[PDB]
């Protein structure tokens, strides 16, 4: 596709003034809620586009940031 998960995370970091450390912080309550872990290292791998998130982390980050899963995956759809 045209857009990556990497691109979307970067779009959110810029538009919402969040660094990776902030996003990771926001996710922790949801990590415990869902019982699904996201480490700092793995998050940077998503941002730098070295790794693409599995469907577990797509859901996690999407609920954390309040965006749609499809959007977060890079698809050309509405954000909310």
Author numbering: 1 to 80
Provide passages from the article that reported this PDB entry.
Co-crystallization experiments with DNA were also carried out both with CI∆58 and CI∆43. One of the crystals diffracted significantly better, however turned out to contain only protein (DNA was absent). Furthermore residues beyond Val80 were not visible suggesting that the better diffracting crystals were obtained because of limited proteolysis occurring during the long crystallization period. The resulting crystal structure is essentially the CI-NTD domain, well described in12, but contains six additional C-terminal residues compared to the previous structure, and is hereon denoted NTD80. The six additional residues mainly consist of hydrophobic amino acids and interact closely with the rest of the domain. The extended CI-NTD crystal structure as well as the NMR relaxation data also precisely identifies residues 81–89 of TP901-1 CI as a flexible linker, while residues 75–80 should be included in the CI-NTD. The crystal structure of the CI-NTD fits well within the envelope in terms of dimensions. Next, we generated a large pool of possible conformers (400.000 copies) using the crystal structure of CI-NTD80 and the model of the dimerization region.
TP901-1 is a temperate bacteriophage of Lactococcus lactis that enters either the lytic or the lysogenic lifecycle when infecting a bacterium. CI from TP901-1 consists of an NTD responsible for DNA binding and a CTD responsible for oligomerization. The full-length protein has been shown to be a hexamer in solution, where CTD is responsible for the oligomerization state of the protein.
